[PDB]
Amino acid sequence: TKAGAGFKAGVKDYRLTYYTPDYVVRDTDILAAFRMTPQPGVPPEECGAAVAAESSTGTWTTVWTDGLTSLDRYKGRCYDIEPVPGEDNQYIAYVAYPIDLFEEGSVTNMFTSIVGNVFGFKALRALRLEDLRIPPAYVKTFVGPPHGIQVERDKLNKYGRGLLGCTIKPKLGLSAKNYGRAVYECLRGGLDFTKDDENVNSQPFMRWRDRFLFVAEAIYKAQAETGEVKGHYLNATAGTCEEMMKRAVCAKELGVPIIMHDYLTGGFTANTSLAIYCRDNGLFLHIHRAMHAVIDRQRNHGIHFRVLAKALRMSGGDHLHSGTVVGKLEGEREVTLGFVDLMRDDYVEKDRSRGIYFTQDWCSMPGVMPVASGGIHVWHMPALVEIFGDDACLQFGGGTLGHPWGNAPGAAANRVALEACTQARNEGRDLAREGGDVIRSACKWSPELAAACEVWKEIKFEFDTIDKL
């Protein structure tokens, strides 16, 4: 009759409970890779354990209630720590979370645990979530994307090339009637889609329902004129769930194909709701990643975009913006190819040279169409087709509405450029090497394309990359 483990009040090291270097991960565990910068005098083991503890079951002092349950069953576990090559005070800490910790179907809840409080701990100087391993058993609890790539192509009846889109400009200040006017002129020239800018919602210069109606007129005019299916991503992003739904309902009632949502500024709870509505009513859902770079830009702190992309795939989206590599916004080539695979593919093997820290099995959850958009023009076409292949949408806002001859000629120039590249690739030409020749031959043939080639010939975006591997 001599006692076992009792309740002992007071502070002890997190590592005593939450650092488990001999733990064998289970196939149902959620795994996290954190890039961690400890404060001086804090051992990496204690730092990793703190992160594991305060994102799962533990707090700063011992609590008696632990004894009513089984900490072994529920605790997050820092099971491995890698030093970062090139860095004196950076480590990759790997944490395993039991599937029991998470609410089924809730990206919101997953983020709340894994990134909720730990980034603000005084004991660390910086923390970045680089990757998550989402196990099939968790993936299967999510509805996921309303449609995904295969279904989208099948409903649109579009195959054999990238899709072409275009954001209407100026960003703000156009009337509903002028919006539809611009939309019609873009679509009729060869673009598959146009779109509301991310910040076009409902404003004094243009109320949403007026826009939706004029845009519907524009879509149907361009479709009847060209004989190709057209769409325009109408923005459902709003201040409340009720408004957002009202806008989705109007799009459904107009019979138009596609709406959009800013999933980070609207938020995961609204986004999941919208994605479910889209599944139940047959609407495509285009996702804009407004605000991502506030979170994902810096190498030392935040959440890498690949994790934000996985989260979107779980929450629901038919399209997600992926970066251009070559345009006005940052996105390194290898990093981008990595997360494009994560967005589109069923199974992606670990590959650190692309920033993939974990093998990710999507267990048949549909793929999300990457959208390359921002500061691109006709000369980027070869590189875009080479990077993304056919399963992408390529968007030219300025590169359409900035054409010297107007929207329809601008659209036609982009469409010609895409089709010429696609044809050249199919014929066995190397777009990485012969890309300039393909575009130059195409400019000589098409007056619309020549006008675009001339205006943007010298325009490039080449800057030192911040988000390096």
Partner: protein, 140 residues
Amino acid sequence: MMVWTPVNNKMFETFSYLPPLTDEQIAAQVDYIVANGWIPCLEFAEADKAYVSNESAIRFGSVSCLYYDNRYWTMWKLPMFGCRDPMQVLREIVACTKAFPDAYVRLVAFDNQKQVQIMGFLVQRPKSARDWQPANKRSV
């Protein structure tokens, strides 16, 4: 400044903004199908069933979103499973166009791993079609 014409300027998805495909250019697309191990198939439709339309939506409640008639065309025989010979595909194009000289005919290919059509383009339009422009008359 040239103006893109809205009149009789209908298009046909992939490659329809380029000069019409030569026989050599079609052969090259066919080689691309075979080199990738995709499944070639031909489809055809009479002129009235060639372009997307809305007539069935008269029967609908509020559910017309991404419903269109005339997306499906008619299959020529069966998809050519196991075909690794481009000449065989070319011979079926000839046979298909001969049996339906007044139809639209498109060549498509399927990927069975993704289960999706992976390529497609028009290979014949009826001689009586007046709803399209030659490349040099698309703008005025």
